[PDB]
Write a protein that binds this ligand. Structure first.
Ligand SMILES: [Mg+2]
Ligand SMILES: [Mg+2]
Ligand SMILES: [Mg+2]
Ligand SMILES: [Mg+2]
Ligand SMILES: [Mg+2]
Ligand SMILES: [Mg+2]
Ligand SMILES: [Mg+2]
Ligand SMILES: [Mg+2]
Ligand SMILES: [Mg+2]
Ligand SMILES: [Mg+2]
Ligand SMILES: [Mg+2]
Ligand SMILES: [Mg+2]
Ligand SMILES: [Mg+2]
Ligand SMILES: [Mg+2]
Ligand SMILES: [Mg+2]
Lengths: 121, 104, 196, 120, 203, 169
RNA sequence: GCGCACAACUGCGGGCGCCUAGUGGGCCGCCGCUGGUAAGCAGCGCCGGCAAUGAGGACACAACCUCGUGCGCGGGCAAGGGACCCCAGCUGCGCACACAGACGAAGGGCGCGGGCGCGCCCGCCCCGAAAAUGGACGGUGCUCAGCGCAGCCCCGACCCCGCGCACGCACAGCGUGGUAGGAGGGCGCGCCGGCGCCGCAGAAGCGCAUGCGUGCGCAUGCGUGGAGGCACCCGCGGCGCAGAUCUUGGUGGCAG
């Protein structure tokens, strides 16, 4: 189904939760680089969790790819379907969340006319 | 089809490891009757299968004997999926045909 | 693979037998050790008794109910040896220790079984005959193990029954050999290979 | 070693494209049809039959046995040239004394004592 | 190469045909392998390993058999293994692991304008040699010859070779590698037995 | 280890066109220790340091073991302990000269903890049986000497075997 | 002014200016010292380290040894090891018997093994050798798991090599640790000037999922909700919290 099959190639299945976000509910899981003087994650001691680096970054051309080779496109109305008509195979289209059900009907019908794959429907 | 009909059983004894750090992609196997390093050269490149059950459904995890290990016929094998440390002490079956590092 | 070993413990150095036992146990073997009163400790007996008295001295002062337990049986003392040759606090080492069963003498459950030896752990192979040595039952009968004589008597009655059955069995191996060498058997055998 | 049959002494005919090999343990003898498997799964034994016939057969419809699947293939087919070259190795097996029992018997692993004992 | 080596053997056996002792002219270069790592190096010894272009262990270079270079090799002899390569070790080091230090030239018709601080480590192709030495040398063996026979082109030929990023040796160093080979280590003058390390280090 | 005869001299200059040639017979691990043991003797007997030495020749003295009998060797050595430097005379029976010094090195290490580098050999002489001074090596010079083996040795590599199996014989 | 001319080796781009931070308690090792009976004491010199340097090996262990360090894969190794814990060992030659190896002195030992001239010398062992919770060659244990040696082999780091990717660079390539600290580019928040839009056919918010993302975070699905909101470009800023015996509010355990 994609034009070119891009493998997933995320360099780790790690999530990089924040340090001690397991132990404290005040510490949310969004990553903060720990800056303490004795902190075992900053010091990169063995047994500590890993910190995000440049090295974990996925490939430039594989980045932000969905369903193999596709790239997501936000759609708010039927006018957004028109620049996707020529490039059907490159983009999976996604209707925005705040689009109402009346306009989602008209997006859904024009997308199957223009042959655009909708991830919402 | 019994695995012991055509394949030689080998016990999964350890992962390839340091004293503490363990590299689980390479599994150390002790083939029965193989007791020296030159005896285990007969099994370099040979395919190996680890047979297990997931929810009662039989699975084959296939691998390749990659390198020798030590002077006592222990060989290191790399499988499709890494062997769990639960299966240490259980048997895996060493095939009599060579497979390649790309194609198990 | 038959991964079940029954070890006869006589003439074996204790820690040298224990390493080959524990290395088998961590590979999934089930080892049973018989005749554990005859497992040998090298060196003179008085040095070995001082090592035991050093063991008996170690106990929890606060509460000896939870202290280092002191074993007077040769089976539990040999089990204590192999216990720390495995990682017994981890689940991999404790599961391996469940595959040991160590006994004094030969219980009648192990009548007519096929017993093994570790030749690299034998005293006649490892030790010099000039050096002294003593068994577990020689030591522990002076530290509260009262069952040395009843072990050896019941050991003998097992060995006499097994020597009797071996006297019968090898005669059957004798007669089957004399039958299979007979020309009546051979021409019976080549007649079947003729038809195949 | 790894096929539908997977412990069956067969005889090797011809190496086919995409790494395959034509084999037939003769279907009168061992109830094994013509097949192609991967080249590697054939463990080579030292004894060779004296087959003089050409093995360039119409391979287009021969049942190919994959590795893990034991998928129940359809039974025997028309066998235009397969009947001739089967009878030639029934001719070859009849010359050698115990070779008929050999190809009929499923393979057992030799009792391991050394790798010298694994010569075949 | 064969004629030069045959002439020395004929010179040597003719000398022992008489009573004499003949040792040839010792080679025009040393081959030097960095044994110790980059840590805990005093500033003089760290500087000499920079001027020998030995910036990591298991790196190998050729240095000239000079009187100043011999004194440089002596002061860092606790960090290096050096000796004499013959023509087989010279050619194996360059043909199997030989890269060129090439400056970029942005204009085709003008080889005089180029970049100073950025030198690329590229393959030792004939055209890289023909561009550096302005038509005077244009093959790899002709670069070996300036190394082997120590010509006037030695300094240009040796510097054109990137330092040999060798592997660590097969079968190990066989002991405690930091001490001298006269004490059982692997660190010092391996006078002509330097191939016993380096041949194990190439692959 | 090996035996080396290493020839060397002062490097010839215009002042001294043919310097005196010296040679040393070294039992060394390789030629680099053999050059090292040669350079110290030129530094300490004469005053020629190693920068001004040319090593003219290094040859491997190897004996022909054509029919391979056992000879007797008397070794005069000088070994340095932790406490001092001493003279010793040891007698060995061996195959070659280079094997007898290997018996010297393993014996001085076993009996005196003298390492190989702590030992300098004054002379190694192959001896008659009549000239041997050690009565322990004299006992094996007698013809028709015989003894049994009392040490048990295994006949394979075993981890566990049944009781009936012969392992020693 | 004319003429001559590129000067040992090796490496390699270099010079200078401006603004500004942090720092100004250090500590450790090596070698060399000073004071002191000494000190894990105090004070110096040189170099290296820790601080700020992970990882491997040291039983654990800021500094020792190896050795640097993006994310992986493959190889080869280092230090250190190869009875079992615990990855990896076999072949030979010695030596030692003391709950030794496993803290030690002067002084000793017809203890054993070598050597020299009864006395010396060298190895191992012994005596000298006594502490308070029970207990530490790390443990098990080991008397060829001790003390020595040789041969061949093996294991073992993020080291080295090779490959791939990420990021940085002046980009046929090279590089990649980091406290205090500086810099760059983004993510996020309230509102502004615009510009594209969305919403009672259900906005924000919320809950649970899925996806994207190195990461800050983003998007969607379902549920809830019931009226607003989003994206981008700009501009303004009371703009991002785990800490402050923080503030306020709520709630636990304690505790029926
Ligand atoms: Mg202090
Ligand atoms: Mg470091
Ligand atoms: Mg560390
Ligand atoms: Mg550590
Ligand atoms: Mg290796
Ligand atoms: Mg092991
Ligand atoms: Mg690196
Ligand atoms: Mg960085
Ligand atoms: Mg910072
Ligand atoms: Mg907003
Ligand atoms: Mg936003
Ligand atoms: Mg504020
Ligand atoms: Mg808070
Ligand atoms: Mg904070
Ligand atoms: Mg309360």
């Amino acid at each position: 189904e994609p034009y070119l099959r891009v493998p997933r190639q995320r360099k780790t299945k790690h999530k990089f939760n924040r340090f001690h976000s397991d132990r404290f509910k005040r510490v949310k899981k969004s990553w903060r680089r720990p800056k303490g003087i004795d902190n075992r994650v900053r010091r990169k001691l063995s047994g500590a969790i890993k910190m995000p680096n440049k090295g974990y970054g996925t490939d430039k051309l594989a980045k932000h790819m969905v369903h193999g080779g596709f790239r997501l496109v936000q759609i708010r109305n039927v006018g957004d379907l028109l620049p996707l008509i020529s490039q059907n195979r490159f983009y999976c289209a996604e209707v925005a969340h705040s689009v109402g059900a009346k306009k989602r009907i008209e997006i859904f019908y024009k997308a199957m006319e223009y042959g655009i794959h909708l991830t919402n429907g | 089809f019994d695995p012991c009909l055509t394949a030689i059983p080998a016990t999964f004894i350890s992962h390839m490891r340091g004293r503490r750090i363990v590299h689980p992609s390479h599994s150390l196997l002790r083939i029965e009757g193989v007791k020296t390093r030159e005896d285990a050269k007969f099994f370099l490149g040979n395919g190996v299968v680890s047979l297990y059950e997931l929810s009662g459904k039989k699975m084959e995890n296939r691998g390749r004997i990659r390198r020798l290990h030590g002077n006592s016929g222990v060989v290191a094998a790399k499988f499709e999926r890494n062997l769990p440390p639960n299966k240490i002490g259980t048997e895996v079956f060493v095939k009599l045909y060579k497979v390649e590092d790309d194609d198990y | 693979i038959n991964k079940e070993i029954i070890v006869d413990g006589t003439g074996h150095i204790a820690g040298k037998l224990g390493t080959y036992i524990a290395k088998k146990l961590l590979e999934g073997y089930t080892i049973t050790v018989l005749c554990a009163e005859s497992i040998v400790l090298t060196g003179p007996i008085h040095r070995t008794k001082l090592r035991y008295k050093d063991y008996l001295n170690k106990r929890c002062l606060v509460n000896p109910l939870r202290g280092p337990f002191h074993y007077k049986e040769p089976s539990k003392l040999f089990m204590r040896l192999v216990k720390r040759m495995v990682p017994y606090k981890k689940k991999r080492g404790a599961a391996a220790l469940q595959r040991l069963q160590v006994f004094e003498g030969i219980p009648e459950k192990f009548e007519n079984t096929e017993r093994s030896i570790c030749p690299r752990a034998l005293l006649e192979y490892c030790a010099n005959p000039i050096r002294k040595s003593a068994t577990y039952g020689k030591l522990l009968s002076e530290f509260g193990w009262k069952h040395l004589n009843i072990t050896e008597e019941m050991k003998k009655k097992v060995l006499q029954r097994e020597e009797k059955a071996k006297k019968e069995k090898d005669a059957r191996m004798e007669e089957i050999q004399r039958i299979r060498e007979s020309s009546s058997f051979n021409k019976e055998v080549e007649e079947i290979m003729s038809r195949i | 070693l790894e096929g539908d049959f997977t412990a069956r002494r067969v005889v090797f005919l011809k190496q086919v494209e995409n790494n395959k090999a034509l084999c037939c343990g003769p279907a009168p003898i061992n109830n094994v049809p013509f097949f192609v498997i991967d080249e590697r799964y054939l463990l080579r034994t030292s004894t060779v039959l004296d087959l003089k016939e050409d093995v360039n057969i119409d391979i287009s419809t021969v049942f190919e046995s994959k590795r893990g699947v034991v998928a129940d293939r359809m039974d025997i087919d028309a066998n235009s040239d397969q009947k001739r070259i089967e009878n030639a190795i029934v001719d070859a097996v009849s010359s050698i004394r115990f070779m008929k029992r050999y190809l009929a018997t499923p393979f057992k692993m030799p009792k391991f004592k050394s790798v010298s004992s694994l010569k075949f | 190469y064969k004629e030069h080596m045959k002439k020395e053997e004929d010179a040597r056996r003719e000398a022992e045909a008489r009573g004499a002792f003949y040792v040839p002219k010792e080679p025009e270069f040393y081959v030097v392998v960095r044994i110790r790592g980059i840590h805990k190096v005093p500033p003089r010894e760290r500087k000499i390993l920079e001027l020998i272009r030995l910036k990591k262990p298991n790196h190998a270079v050729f240095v000239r058999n000079n009187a100043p270079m011999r004194a440089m090799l002596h002061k860092v002899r606790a960090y290096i293994a050096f000796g004499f390569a013959d023509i087989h070790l010279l050619r194996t080091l360059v043909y199997k692991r030989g890269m060129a230090k090439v400056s970029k030239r942005p204009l085709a018709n003008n080889s005089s304008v180029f970049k100073i601080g950025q030198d690329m480590r590229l393959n030792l192709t004939n055209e890289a040699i023909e561009d550096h030495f302005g038509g005077r040398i244009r093959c790899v063996e002709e670069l070996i010859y300036q190394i082997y026979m120590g010509t006037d082109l030695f300094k240009k030929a040796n510097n054109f070779l990137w330092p040999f990023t060798l592997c660590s040796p097969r079968k190990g160093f066989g002991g405690r590698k930091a001490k001298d080979i006269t004490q059982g280590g692997s660190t010092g003058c391996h006078y002509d037995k330097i191939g016993n390390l380096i041949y194990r280090m190439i692959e | 280890i090996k035996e080396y005869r290493i020839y060397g001299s002062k490097m010839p200059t215009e002042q001294e066109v043919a310097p005196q040639i010296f040679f040393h017979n070294v039992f060394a691990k390789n030629e680099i220790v053999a050059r090292s043991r040669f350079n110290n003797l030129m530094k300490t007997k004469y005053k020629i340091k190693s920068g001004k030495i040319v090593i003219l020749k290094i040859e491997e003295l190897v004996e022909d073991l054509k029919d391979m009998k056992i000879k007797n060797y008397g070794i005069q050595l000088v070994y340095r302990s932790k406490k001092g430097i001493h003279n010793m005379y040891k007698e060995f029976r061996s195959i070659s000269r280079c094997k007898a010094v290997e018996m010297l090195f393993n014996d001085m290490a076993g009996r005196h903890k003298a390492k190989r580098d702590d030992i300098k050999i004054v002379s190694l002489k192959e001896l008659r049986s009549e000239d041997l001074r050690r009565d322990r090596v004299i006992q094996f010079t007698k013809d028709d000497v015989m003894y049994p083996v009392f040490k048990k040795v295994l006949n394979s590599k075993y981890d566990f075997v049944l009781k009936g199996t012969n392992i020693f014989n």
